[PDB]
Amino acid sequence: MKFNENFVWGVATSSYQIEGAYNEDGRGKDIWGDYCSIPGIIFDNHNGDKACEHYYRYKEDVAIMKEMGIKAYRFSIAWARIFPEGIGKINQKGVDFYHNLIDELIKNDIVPYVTLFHWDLPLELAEKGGWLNDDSVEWFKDYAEFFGKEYGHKIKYIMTFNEPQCTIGLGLQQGIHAPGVKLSPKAVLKSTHNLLKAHGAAVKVLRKVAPNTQLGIAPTCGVALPISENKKDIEIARKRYFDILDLNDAYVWSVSLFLDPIVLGDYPTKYYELYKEHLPKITQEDLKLISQPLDFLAQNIYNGYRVSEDENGNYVYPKRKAGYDHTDMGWPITPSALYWGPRFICERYNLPFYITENGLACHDVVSLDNKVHDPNRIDFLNKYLLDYSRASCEGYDIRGYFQWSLMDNFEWREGYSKRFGMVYVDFETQKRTIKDSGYWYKKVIEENGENLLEHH
């Protein structure tokens, strides 16, 4: 067919983007709420104080997912809602909420896929240096250990970190994400190393406290795309996809920087040569701690870029055609990224593969008929899933697909100016309206993708 019988169809959210209740029920502050307090940082000075008020309306959101036949729901845990100080005293109302949300998903036949860290680092830990502090490995370990002890018996999928490229790169190297800083290469690489150690420490303890929970991680990157399907152009894209970038570029946006240590046991050789004078102290236990065996690998994939080389072996990036298909972010629409991306990742790491995020922003409106018509989203998803199907038919071990946001939410620096959900959300009334893509997606799950349109 188009997909295997076990293909997991799902949707994805994150805590800070949907939950709201930022200063309620004992929830501590995080780095993004603090980031939003700086005037002019967020579009129109939006923040996540209320967001979609999912903390109060989660029962309606589960029922909306049941109305679409959604069988899996990827979401994240507000670390500051369970540990308002990052470490130490637990916030029982926070633990109670996630029990109630998880139980609500289980009761509605929805498989929870849990992200432990989706960027909302507790502010108390941030003011102790965050990932710069070597104690961050212990902080995240104890945080993971509690969640496994408290929910491991009813959570079968846990991924540690969401897009460390954004937390480390945009957050500490490029000054684009919270906390919004541009630090030394030493600081960024020590931070990178402490995050990878925190991942490994979390995986290790989660195997003792949650021995029946499958463990993974969901990084992100742009997908290098070959200009043709002959052997030489594919190799160029592959080499670029897993390359280590120079220190004068946005070098944290590397697949191998995080996944080679995690899966292969060490940083790439280029890492040690290029970053030599800024390297953190690396022990083989560090590498043995980071390289804990995983059960699956995940990836958030939104778009790709054509890459080739010139006579000097330097990367060449061809222009995009005038008027190319794009989204409300101005991002390009490149469905082949959901083939080459998964293919390259499976060939290098040979792990069961999930797409934990894929979607687009559309300038959606409630039209005069009280409906939300988003045919551009349907076409986007249809084209991307066709190339995803191509990877599964060629034998790559792809296990599922999570369409990014179930509902419109806080799109970080863009605030609420960008809508990624299949459910429209009026952020004043909090009225949820399922978009056309949501009803289309319901049929995609019902028919496991044999319904998808073709002639790509």
Closest listed residue to residue 382, CA positions, set 439, 427, 440:
440
Residue 163 annotated as catalytic = yes
- Whole-angstrom distance, CA of residue 253 vs CA of residue 223: 11
Inter-axis angle of helices 136-151 and 92-107, to 10 degrees?
A: 50
Is the peptide bond preceding residue 39 cis, with omega within 30 degrees of 0?
no
The dihedral built from the CA positions of residue 108, 110, 114 and 115, taken in this order, carries a sign that is negative
- Whole-angstrom distance, CA of residue 315 vs CA of residue 317: 7
Phi-psi group of 453: left, alpha or beta (phi > 0 → left; psi -120 to 50 → alpha; rest → beta): beta
For residues 158 and 203, is the Cβ–Cβ distance under 8 A? no
- Retrieve residue 272's tokens: 């040690």
Residue 145 annotated as catalytic = no
- Whole-angstrom distance, CA of residue 239 vs CA of residue 256: 10
Closest listed residue to residue 226, CA positions, set 312, 156, 307:
307
Beta strands per DSSP E along 118-263 = 157-162, 214-218, 223-225
SS3 content of the chain, % helix, strand, coil (to 5): 40, 15, 45
Q: Rounded to 5 degrees, what angle do the CA atoms 408, 414, 418 make?
A: 35
> Of the listed 124, 145, 357, 411, which one is catalytic?
357
DSSP 368-414: TTS----HHHHHHHHHHHHHHHHHHHTT--EEEEEEE-SB----GGG
- Retrieve residue 279's tokens: 């390297």
> Of the listed 24, 163, 285, 394, which one is catalytic?
163
Phi-psi group of 27: left, alpha or beta (phi > 0 → left; psi -120 to 50 → alpha; rest → beta): beta
Which residues are tagged catalytic?
163, 357
